[PDB]
Ligand code: HEM
Ligand code: HEM
Ligand SMILES: c1ccc2[nH]cnc2c1
């Protein structure tokens with residue numbers, strides 16, 4: 687289930703983080719408006735750009751902590767507030783998050799593993815509602 | 824305290840994992856006997872390989888699972904048994920683990936980051952005694 691999936695992802699986290707983030711950028715190419723340094727690059731080129739790997743791993747280190755602290759796929763209010771208040775996230779609205787989690791769930795369903803894809807769909811929806819409550823537009 | 828330290832380490836796990844493993848190898852150069860593939864390389868030579876990082880981070884992920892499942896810094900017997908039974912750990916003894924945790928606590932005390940060094944010292948001692956109870960020499 688959801689708790690096991692956190693363990694699965696954490697067991698190969700840099701690889702999953704990069705592959706899921708690439709699936710997001712390739713499903714929604716207009717979302718690169720938020721990531722201008724990644725324009726004009728193939729997947730293999732991005733996987734040899736130092737900030738793409740280092741930043742995307744740090745994103746997923748925190749995402750897995752937020753998931754682990756959740757109850758029945760509902761995150762802590764303190765975690766939602768951190769995500770809204772972060773200076774890096776100043777330009778963002780909740781649609782940006784909705785699209786990230788749509789891409790993550792699609793990746794899981796296509797992997798041919800045993801991910802609990804439906805719980806990740808709930809977690810993304812419940813994180814969006816918590817972000818709205820914490821003041822994201 | 825101990826629970827916050829797990830969150831600090833996971834937030835930047837690949838960087839902490841590399842720096843603590845290098846502190847261990849530099850404190851106890853004879854322990855590099857267990858790691859023939861790292862002979863004849865400086866710190867920055869080892870880190871220049873994205874694989875050294877991949878591999879070391881997977882080690883520290885398991886360490887953090889065992890730490891988070893502990894009660895009052897006493898690991899589960901079943902987690903000690905996993906570490907004894909791993910094929911890659913055949914022909915280790917408890918002294919190898921003792922040295923690792925001495926280096927880890929020394930790194931935490933020298934760092935600018937607040938860590939509960941006394942809890943990690945207890946965890947390492949209690950892990951050694953659990954390894955012995957699960958059949959390590
Ligand atoms: C639960 C979901 C998310 C988590 C846990 C998360 C976490 C983070 C973290 C930790 C950083 C700092 C990385 C670093 O500089 O080392 C960051 C930066 C950033 N985040 Fe997020 N984030 C999430 C969702 C999003 C989404 C949906 C977008 C946009 C579609 C986004 C856009 C950014 C941008 C533009 C930066 C700064 C640029 C960069 O680091 O390359 N984030 N985020
Ligand atoms: C709580 C402590 C420890 C944990 C969590 C741990 C975890 C791991 C894991 C997960 C692997 C497999 C990595 C992979 O294949 O991707 C591994 C392999 C290995 N471990 Fe440990 N380990 C611990 C302590 C030690 C100690 C103390 C030594 C020796 C001083 C050691 C020596 C090895 C060796 C030789 C391998 C195989 C070769 C290598 O991975 O470089 N381990 N360990
Ligand atoms: C998901 C994927 C990559 C990211 N980079 C910064 N925040 C992110 C969220």
Ligand SMILES: c1ccc2[nH]cnc2c1
Nearest residue numbers: 843844847878879882923
């Ligand atoms: C500590 C540091 C590096 C390691 N590699 C394999 N097991 C380990 C324990």
